[PDB]
Enzyme design. Structure first.
Site, PDB file in Angstrom:
ATOM      1  CB  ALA A 176      -7.017  -6.820   2.766  1.00  0.00           C
ATOM      2  CB  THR A 234      -0.827   0.192   1.309  1.00  0.00           C
ATOM      3  OG1 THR A 234      -1.561  -0.989   1.131  1.00  0.00           O
ATOM      4  CG2 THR A 234      -1.775   1.114   1.253  1.00  0.00           C
TER       5      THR A 234
END
Ligand SMILES: [Mg+2]
Lengths: 244, 231, 212, 235, 222, 240, 4, 233, 250
Positions: C49, C1
């Protein structure tokens, strides 16, 4: 079930009184009178024993006056056994505070927690209240000398002079009459004994029907001493003020 | 009288008055009927309303694909008991891959109700139930009362004036018991049975409630325009 | 990310990538890493996630209950502290989150809180979070001014995510852009790096390391 | 004395029946269901003129699509509302959708009989629960401390209820517009209220699919009050 | 030391069209280098027009499917027989999975059906409940072989309009069910060729507004 | 645990234990709250069948819950300590998690909730206390005054009184308080509060307490003379 | 499980 | 967290046209020590189900007790206990599968691999497997342990897919099972010569054969094998 | 099932009496007389072994019990209540004292613990007060000899000499005449034996009188030798024979 046999100790009357608290107070009103008087330079605790037998071991005895810590003592009116339960709690509570803060417990803080315990027995748990009223006498460096009382309701208030147990009506009138703010300890000692002398249900006040304590700064410089009087010491202070 | 303070007290003639008072709420309940053939089982229930602005309280609850019931009395108590049944039917599936026998459903309800008739502080259930289902031994109808008594029947009815229907079904027995392979005929007989319990009222479209379960029909409930066929 | 959020003259910019990875396997290029909590509140996701997604939608439910009970929108400070106090309870259990709680209230003004799964909570004007945070920082810091126009701010945020998407193997897919003002948040589109890189290279003349 | 969970010889729960008496002493609450919305109106009944009436909260939001009015021991409703809100928000968390009005009402009603020797007595408050959902449209529910709930087209609860219900029986039809229903709630409230109805001692609210649950300000309600007198005077 | 997990192999694949969706999976079940069964289905009709597969550790896969099927049952009981929308199923499954965050179900989950506008929908989950709607997803052992093929053939990735100088992308478009079944069958035969845990049989569940249909095809048994 | 349902319904739909708790409030010393334009004043009667009291240490009747909110009460004194402690703990917990001190409404709602809980829990009796809670929300200058009672109901008041002879002083305030024109200043508001108490009290000697609360945590208790002045000044305007 |  | 002590080796099984066959040897090993020889590892439940178990024998005996208690419990308040409400093989299996998976989920498994063989009341053949992990599967042939490696390939030569089951007689299938047992005795170092075999037929019911022996063994060629490469005498 | 009696069975009446404590004291009034006398070098406690049937063997029923090697107890009231109090008293001497300080508790503190137990039966849910009054005689290094009376309320008092039960009023008067602060232990035994005859109806010998002392250390009763700082129990029960020896010189 068992609901049949439940007295419901923690309910209101239609007038909004707590039956059991009222009846506990009624019990206390037949107990030996105890008096606290606060001076500028100390405090007096005086209390009358529930009528003696000549064969009672009077010197190794304690019924009225108990030490909570080094700076705080109480005078009891009511059930002795009930009072000891509360006294050990209060003693432990004092030590927890000291252990936590490295400072002796302020008098009010101790008094509040004991009164909070009593309050609980009037609101939950379905148990009978403690049949005890205390006079607390102590010193701390915030307020100096302090007198408080608590009763089975768990209500507490502070006093210059106060009595609990039997004949508090007569006793309170007499203290009100002779008490004055600038008073020394030795004057308060006299006032306490003279008040018991006149309110007693006995024929005459003797050493063997009394317990007595002072809390003075009368050790050495800016520190405080509890003196729980021995029988011979009471006999002397009874002569010294001309009651015998 | 002095012996009706709770369920844990017998009267001097050996009665349980709180259980009997629980039975009384059933009697104030709107009528409902159960009946069965060998291929299907049917519930008919008269729904009651508060006034003309209100809905008509549901009296039929699905328990599984093969089981369900009708209620008379305290509705929340039916919700508790029907929910217990849903769980028990469910447990039988997940653990044994087995559809719960209607008879066992009966025994399980009896034992659940009974506990509340022997212990202090609880209270008996205030509702009667008619359980229908189709299982490995065919169509079934059960009658549950909150005394814990459960009974298997060809037909029955409970609630106010249920005695009309229960008499009708008692004569009709030999007819309805042999309405096999015909859903609509068994229902018709059920609707007629319930009509023997009506007074000053008759069956409207948002008043009648029917349910059926059987050989190749999952337990399903009919309300509203779906029951107009039967009035 | 890679995720970022910065305060400026004209409110708050929030920009994130959309890649999810399991090791070197690219699991998805279309993850929505911004969660829209309420019309004045945004949360960004980085780390696990599931952890992020689950607890940040849970956070939205808690913020909704605040406004039902208190007849008032929740403060950014209080919303961020619900999440941080939650993850602090799970400290050591292995939750993995790096989040920013971004929003405007009248009492606070535009506000950003960084909140992570070690239980760190920080108010600040600029944060970048994720495996690509350093790449984003490099561009963002060296072009940041308080006075950027809304137009420039939006581009810088977008360009910073692009930088990280390019260099960081574990960032990519597309850029999602938000602008937060006194009137709430405004979405400024999904931007595939597939086309955005080449567009930026051409128009800006940057990315000379790359075979044109 | 005698158990809190005891049946009467008629087969009713003493404690539930007695709580129903407490509800009759409550201030009036009225709800009307239309195809354009559901109106909820209540009587504030300030016990003294010094008490600031806007602080009287007897209409309450549960979710955007569900509202609530109460009557009886209104302090008992706080936890019911709290449960309702949690149940609604939780459902949306678990299922990414709006919770049905009936399901909400059933959830609140499950609380009701959880008392005994769980809480110590039934609730002393009835609830009117009004909302919208995609399946069954606009709905009004009357939730009692018996655990029973009924759907209504219109319903009144509280002290003025038997008078107001008879009135609602006459006035309700399946084609009421929202504006007609607002007026009607105002009208019926003015009839059964002790003191004279104004914008400070009554309050209105509705829930529509489009804008959800809104409580009306005093300025808006005052105008519907004015509009109501001019309708009655004019025939 | 006792290891509570195992790996039963196989692979699954979900594709969504305009008014339909498919969920396919091979029927082989394995442990280590042994075949347990050549036909053990792992794609299930769950009711309300939802199909579900949870591929990886079969025992966990079965437990999860059982729990979700049961969840659908109670959704009917508690909310007046309301239809469980695919978006609501997805969210419910997230909570089922995340509820075991600290002792996870070792499965990659895919569900398929129709959204509330009647369009085809595929949702996929990581083992602890992260989820996302897509046109397209392969899961399980051969996921890494099949997924990039799907990016290319379903979403037309890296494909440009001839003679536009690589400037105009191949335009996106829904596929017919006939086209989708072709991509599924080719995906699985290719996967069977190169992955030892994939083979034996292929079962496809197709979901339209008229319900759930099945199709079965033989796959290489080596 | 002791389980008995003490607060239950009677055939007429009353909860007698709650109603008898109200009787305990009625017997309590009088308390009054009046809010000005920009302050709130809390006045409290102290029953004067008590001399030899030590006022330094005797529990005062107005309690700070936080530095911007005060609470006073009528009823059982021991009961009121329990509510004050709980309220004080909640005030700190609210600051810890919300990073903002409580609103007066929030804190009132909490105390009210505690009182209600004790009306439908087994083994406990209701609180024999009604409270007046007053102060200013953080960063707000609009004054707040709320009242709670044993049942759990709470509401906002322009001015209000509770305890013995509260109906006499409510009577007073109802004709002397203008909603349109609240006591525009501290001086003005303190006076109205003392006047209302003088309807019921006796001498304004060691009989009246007043605590003034202004915005931004500005709370001060008046002492004897400062109050005494108000008493003196009203009787000298009285002979007319 | 994937990370972001 | 366990480790198996006294253990049973392979359980092998297959479907044929009218029913199912299942077999398992009578040995309880203790590591490499062949400690116990009269151990029955096939447990019949009713007259329609046999449960064959490999792995830890103490856990097998526990499972025996569960099954025997299950029969008792099913008879309770059940007038159709020996008819429509008799225990099916699918009920017995699901119960075991439920327990196996719960025990693995509590990190305290029953250290077994189980095959439930039987005939359903509608005449359908039931053959399903479950183990310590709670993993379950069905196939025309099933085996545990070495059986999975050596019996399955042999039994699948007979029944390779669903359609081969109608074509397989009980004589053919018993032959395959008995031959598979010989192979396992040649090649599994923890097998015994003695075994039990059970057939559950939809017509003849349950036939349970005890004290079978592996016979017709080929050992003669052993005499011709001298040395390990170059040695002659 | 289980104890649903969690509320007090002893409560204040409107006059302030605690009924069950008063009634428990009435049960003590009914009880057989027991007494204790404190000498300068010892304490004596005594009571009548009033047998239920003459087929009963009353040596098997001990009314005077050792609590610690230096502490003994006797009672008046209900025997079974006393028996379980002794069990509890013995144990609390260990758990709340000896296991902490490695020595036996002083008399007042053990008494204090027994009082606590009896107070709890006066306030705890679902119980009645104990129907007994105890006299506890004991010795400890820093307090010397002491005698305490414990009542159903949990109250205790130190006595020079006292008596409880049936003929206590008469016996207390007798003891006021005879007691002085110079009594040697043998004199106290003698006075105890005289006081007890007033209240005993039937036979008066060493088989119907139970009598124990707290006096000198008894090394011969220790059971072992070799630790010179351990000197033996000060508690001793007088034998049937020892009592009869003192009854001829009565
Ligand atoms: Mg392959």
């Amino acid at each position: 079930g068992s609901r049949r046999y439940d007295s419901r100790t923690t309910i209101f009357s239609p007038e909004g009184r707590l039956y059991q608290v009222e009846y506990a107070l009624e019990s206390i009103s037949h107990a030996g009178t105890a008096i606290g008087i606060m001076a500028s330079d100390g405090i007096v605790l005086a209390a009358e024993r529930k009528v003696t037998s000549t064969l009672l071991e009077q010197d190794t005895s304690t019924e009225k006056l108990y030490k909570l810590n080094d700076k705080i003592a109480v005078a009891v009116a009511g059930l002795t056994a009930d009072a000891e339960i509360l006294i050990n709690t209060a003693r432990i509570h004092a030590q927890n505070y000291l252990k936590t803060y490295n400072e002796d417990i302020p008098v009010e803080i101790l008094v509040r927690r004991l009164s909070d315990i009593k309050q609980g027995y009037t609101q939950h748990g379905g148990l009978r209240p403690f049949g005890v009223s205390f006079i607390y006498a102590g010193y701390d460096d915030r307020y100096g000398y302090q007198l408080y009382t608590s009763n089975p309701s768990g209500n507490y208030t502070g006093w210059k002079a106060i009595s609990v147990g039997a004949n508090t009506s007569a006793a309170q009138t007499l203290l009100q009459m002779d008490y004055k703010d600038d008073m020394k300890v030795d004057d308060a000692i006299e006032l306490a004994l003279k008040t018991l002398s006149k309110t007693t249900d006995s024929s005459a006040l003797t050493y063997d029907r009394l317990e007595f304590a002072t809390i003075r700064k009368g050790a050495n410089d800016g520190e405080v001493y509890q003196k729980i009087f021995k029988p011979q010491e009471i006999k002397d202070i009874l002569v010294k003020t001309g009651i015998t | 009288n002095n012996y009706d303070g709770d369920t844990v007290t017998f009267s001097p003639t050996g009665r349980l008055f709180q259980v009997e008072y629980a039975l009384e709420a059933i009697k104030q309940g709107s009528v409902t009927v159960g009946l069965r053939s060998n291929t299907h089982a049917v519930l008919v229930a008269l729904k009651r309303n508060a006034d003309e602005l209100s809905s008509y309280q549901k009296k039929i609850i699905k328990c599984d694909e093969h089981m369900g019931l009708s209620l008379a009395g305290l509705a929340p108590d039916a919700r508790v008991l029907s929910n217990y049944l849903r769980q028990q039917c469910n447990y039988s599936s997940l653990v044994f891959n087995r559809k719960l026998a209607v008879e066992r459903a009966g025994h399980l309800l009896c034992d659940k109700a009974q506990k509340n008739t022997q212990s202090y502080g609880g209270r008996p259930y205030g509702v009667g139930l008619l359980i229908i289902g189709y299982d490995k031994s065919g169509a079934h109808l059960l009658e549950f009362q909150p005394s814990g008594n459960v009974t298997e029947l060809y037909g029955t009815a409970i609630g106010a004036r249920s005695q009309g229907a229960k008499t009708y079904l008692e004569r009709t027995l030999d007819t309805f018991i042999k309405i096999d392979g015909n859903p609509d005929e068994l229902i018709k007989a059920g609707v007629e049975a319930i009509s023997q319990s009506l007074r000053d009222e008759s069956l409207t479209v948002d008043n009648l409630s029917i349910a059926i379960v059987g050989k190749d029909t999952p337990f399903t409930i009919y309300d509203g325009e779906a029951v107009a066929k039967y009035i | 990310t890679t995720t970022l959020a910065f305060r400026f003259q004209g409110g708050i910019i929030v920009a994130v990538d959309s890649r999810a990875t399991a090791g070197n396997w690219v699991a998805s290029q279309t993850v929505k890493k911004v969660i829209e909590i309420n019309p004045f509140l945004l949360g960004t996701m980085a780390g696990g996630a599931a952890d992020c997604q689950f607890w940040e939608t849970w956070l939205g439910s808690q913020c909704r209950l605040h406004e039902l009970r208190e007849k008032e929108r929740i403060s950014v400070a209080a919303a961020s502290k619900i999440l941080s106090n939650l993850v602090y309870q799970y400290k050591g259990a292995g939750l993995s989150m790096g989040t920013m709680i971004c929003g405007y209230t009248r009492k606070e003004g535009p506000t950003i809180y960084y909140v992570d799964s070690d239980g760190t909570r920080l108010k600040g004007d600029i944060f970048c979070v994720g495996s690509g945070q350093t790449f984003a920082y490099g561009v963002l810091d060296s072009n940041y001014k308080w006075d950027l126009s809304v137009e420039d701010a939006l581009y810088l945020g977008k360009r910073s995510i692009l930088a990280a998407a390019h260099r960081d193997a574990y960032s990519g897919g597309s850029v999602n852009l938000y602008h937060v003002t006194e009137d709430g948040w405004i979405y400024h589109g999904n931007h595939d790096v597939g086309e955005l890189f080449w567009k930026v290279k051409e128009e800006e003349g940057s990315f000379n390391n790359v075979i044109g | 004395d005698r158990g809190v969970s005891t049946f009467s010889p008629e087969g009713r729960l003493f404690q539930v029946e007695y709580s129903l008496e407490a509800i009759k002493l409550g201030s009036t609450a009225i709800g009307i269901a239309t195809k354009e919305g559901v109106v909820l109106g209540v009587e504030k009944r300030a016990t003294s003129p010094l008490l600031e009436s806007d602080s009287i909260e007897k209409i309450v939001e549960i979710d955007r699509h569900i509202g609530c009015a109460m009557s009886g021991l209104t302090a008992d409703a706080r936890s019911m509302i709290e449960h309702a809100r949690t149940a609604a928000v939780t459902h949306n968390l678990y299922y990414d959708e709006d919770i049905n009005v009936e399901s909400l009402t059933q959830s609140v009603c499950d609380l009701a009989l959880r008392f005994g020797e769980l809480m110590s007595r039934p609730f002393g408050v009835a609830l009117l629960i009004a909302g919208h959902d995609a399946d069954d449209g606009y709905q009004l529910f009357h939730a009692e401390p018996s655990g029973t709930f009924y759907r209504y087209n219109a319903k009144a609860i509280g002290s003025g209820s038997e008078g107001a219900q008879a009135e609602l029986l006459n006035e309700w039809h399946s084609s009421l517009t929202l504006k007609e229903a607002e007026l009607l709630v105002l009208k019926i409230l003015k009839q059964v209220m002790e003191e004279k109805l104004d914008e400070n001692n009554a309050q209105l609210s509705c829930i529509t699919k489009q804008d959800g649950f809104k409580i009306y300000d005093n300025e808006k309600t005052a105008e519907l009050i004015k509009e109501l007198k001019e309708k009655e005077a004019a025939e | 030391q006792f290891n509570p997990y195992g790996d039963n192999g196989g692979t699954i694949l979900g594709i969504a069209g305009e008014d339909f969706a498919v969920l396919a999976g091979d029927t082989r079940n394995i442990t280590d280098y042994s075949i347990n069964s050549r036909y053990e289905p792992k794609v299930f009709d769950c009711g309300d027009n939802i199909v579900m597969s949870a591929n990886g550790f079969a025992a966990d896969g079965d437990a999860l499917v059982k729990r979700f099927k049961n969840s659908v049952k109670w959704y009917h009981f508690d909310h007046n027989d309301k239809k469980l929308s695919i978006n609501s199923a997805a969210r419910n499954i997230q909570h089922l999975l995340y509820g075991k965050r600290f002792f996870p179900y070792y499965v990659h989950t895919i569900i398929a059906g129709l959204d509330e506008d009647g369009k085809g929908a595929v949702y996929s989950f990581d083992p602890v409940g992260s989820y996302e709607r897509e046109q397209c997803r392969a899961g399980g052992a051969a996921a890494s072989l099949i997924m990039p093929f799907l990016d290319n053939q379903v979403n037309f990735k890296n494909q440009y309009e001839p003679g536009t100088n690589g400037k105009v992308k191949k335009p996106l478009k829904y596929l017919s069910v006939e086209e989708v079944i072709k991509l599924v069958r080719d995906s699985f035969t290719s996967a069977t060729e190169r992955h030892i845990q994939v083979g034996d049989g292929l079962e496809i569940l197709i979901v339209t507004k008229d319900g759930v249909r099945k199709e079965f095809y033989e796959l290489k048994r080596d | 645990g002791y389980d008995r349902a003490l607060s239950i319904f009677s055939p007429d739909g009353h909860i007698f234990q709650v109603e008898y708790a109200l009787e305990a409030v009625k017997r309590g010393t009088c308390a009054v709250g009046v809010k000005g334009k920009n302050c709130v004043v809390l006045g409290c009667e102290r029953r004067s069948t008590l001399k030899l009291q030590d006022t330094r240490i005797t529990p005062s009747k107005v309690s700070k819950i936080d530095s911007h909110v005060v609470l006073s009460f009528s009823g059982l004194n021991a009961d009121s300590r329990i509510l004050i402690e709980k309220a004080r703990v909640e005030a700190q917990s609210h600051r810890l998690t919300l990073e903002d001190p409580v609103t007066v409404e929030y804190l009132t709602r909490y105390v009210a909730g505690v009182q209600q809980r004790y009306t439908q829990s087994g083994g406990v009796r209701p609180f024999g206390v009604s409270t007046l809670i007053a102060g200013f929300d953080p960063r707000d200058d609009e004054p707040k005054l709320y009242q709670t009672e044993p049942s759990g109901i709470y509401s906002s008041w322009s001015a209000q009184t509770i305890g013995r002879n509260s109906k006499t002083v409510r009577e007073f305030l109802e004709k002397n308080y203008d909603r349109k024109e609240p006591p525009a200043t501290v001086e003005e508001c303190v006076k109205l509060t003392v006047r209302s108490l003088l309807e019921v009290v006796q001498t304004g000697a060691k009989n009246i307490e007043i605590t003034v609360v202004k915005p931004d945590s500005d709370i001060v208790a008046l002492s004897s003379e400062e109050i005494n002045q108000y008493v003196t000044q009203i009787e000298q305007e009285k002979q007319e | 499980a994937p990370l972001x | 967290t366990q480790q198996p002590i006294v253990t049973g080796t392979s359980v092998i099984s297959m479907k044929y046209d009218n029913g199912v066959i299942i077999a398992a040897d009578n040995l309880g090993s203790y590591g490499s020590l062949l400690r116990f020889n009269g151990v029955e590892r096939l447990i019949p439940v009713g007259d329609n189900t046999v449960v064959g178990i490999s792995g830890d024998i103490s856990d097998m005996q526990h499972i025996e007790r569960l099954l025997k208690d299950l029969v008792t419990e099913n008879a309770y308040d059940n007038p159709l206990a020996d008819a429509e409400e008799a225990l099916e093989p699918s009920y017995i299996f699901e119960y075991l599968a439920t327990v196996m998976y719960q025990r693995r989920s509590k990190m305290n498994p029953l250290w077994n691999a189980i095959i439930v063989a039987g005939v359903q009341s509608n005449g359908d053949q039931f053959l399903r497997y479950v183990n310590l992990l709670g993993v379950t599967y069905s196939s025309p042939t099933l085996a545990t342990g070495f059986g999975a490696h050596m019996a399955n390939p042999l039994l699948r030569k007979v029944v390779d897919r669903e359609s081969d089951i109608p074509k397989t007689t009980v004589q053919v299938a018993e032959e395959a099972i008995v031959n598979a047992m010989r192979v396992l005795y040649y090649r599994d170092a923890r097998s015994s010569r003695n075994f039990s075999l059970a057939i559950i037929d939809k017509n003849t019911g349950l036939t349970f054969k005890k004290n079978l022996q592996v016979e017709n063994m080929k050992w003669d060629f052993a005499k011709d094998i001298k040395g390990y490469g170059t040695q002659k005498i | 099932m289980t104890d649903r009696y969690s509320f007090s069975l002893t409560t204040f009446s409107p006059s302030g009496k605690l009924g069950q404590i008063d009634y428990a004291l009435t049960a003590v009034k009914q009880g057989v007389t027991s007494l204790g006398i404190k000498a300068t070098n010892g304490v004596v406690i005594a009571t009548e072994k009033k047998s239920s049937s003459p087929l009963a063997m009353s040596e098997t029923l001990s009314k005077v019990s050792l609590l610690t090697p230096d502490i003994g107890a006797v009672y008046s009231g209900m025997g079974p209540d006393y028996r379980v109090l002794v069990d509890k008293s013995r144990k609390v001497a260990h758990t709340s004292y000896k296991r902490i300080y490695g020595e036996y508790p002083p008399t007042k503190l053990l008494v204090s613990e027994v009082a606590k137990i009896m107070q709890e039966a006066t306030q705890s849910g679902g119980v009645r007060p104990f129907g007994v009054s105890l006299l506890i005689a004991g010795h400890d290094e820093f307090n010397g000899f002491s005698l305490y009376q414990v009542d159903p309320s949990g109250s205790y008092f130190p006595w020079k000499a006292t008596a409880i039960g049936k003929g206590s009023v008469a016996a207390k008067t007798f003891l006021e005449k005879r007691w002085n602060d110079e009594l040697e232990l043998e004199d106290a035994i003698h006075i105890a034996l005289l006081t007890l005859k007033e209240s005993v109806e039937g036979e008066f010998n060493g088989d119907t009188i139970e009598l124990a002392i707290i006096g000198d250390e008894n090394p011969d009763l220790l059971g072992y030798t070799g630790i010179p700082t351990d000197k033996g129990p000060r508690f001793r029960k007088l034998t049937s024979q020892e009592i009869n020896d003192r009854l001829e010189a009565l």
